[PDB]
Amino acid sequence: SEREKRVSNAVEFLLDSRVRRTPTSSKVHFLKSKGLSAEEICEAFTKVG
């Protein structure tokens, strides 16, 4: 599904060691800019440990 693709792509982005030091505020805006909702964003954040 389109939602599953959005969330799974987000998780993969977030797991990249190179993006760790990226401000969480900008991660939120970035994910919104890729079409994710607030609930999708929270789901993506918590799939990462």
Domain ranges of the chain: 1-49
Cα–Cα distance, 6 to 36 (Å, whole number): 7
Method: X-ray
Pair of tokens at residue 34? 């890729």
DSSP code, position 18: G
Asked whether the beta carbons of 10 and 41 are under 8 A apart, the reply is yes
Under CATH, which number does the domain 1-49 receive? 1.10.10.10
Cα–Cα distance, 37 to 21 (Å, whole number): 22
Listed in sequence order, the DSSP H helices in the chain are: 2-15, 24-33, 38-47
Number of neighbouring beta carbons within 10 Å of residue 36: 20
Question: Which resolution, in Å, applies to this structure?
Answer: 1.6
Cα–Cα distance, 37 to 6 (Å, whole number): 10
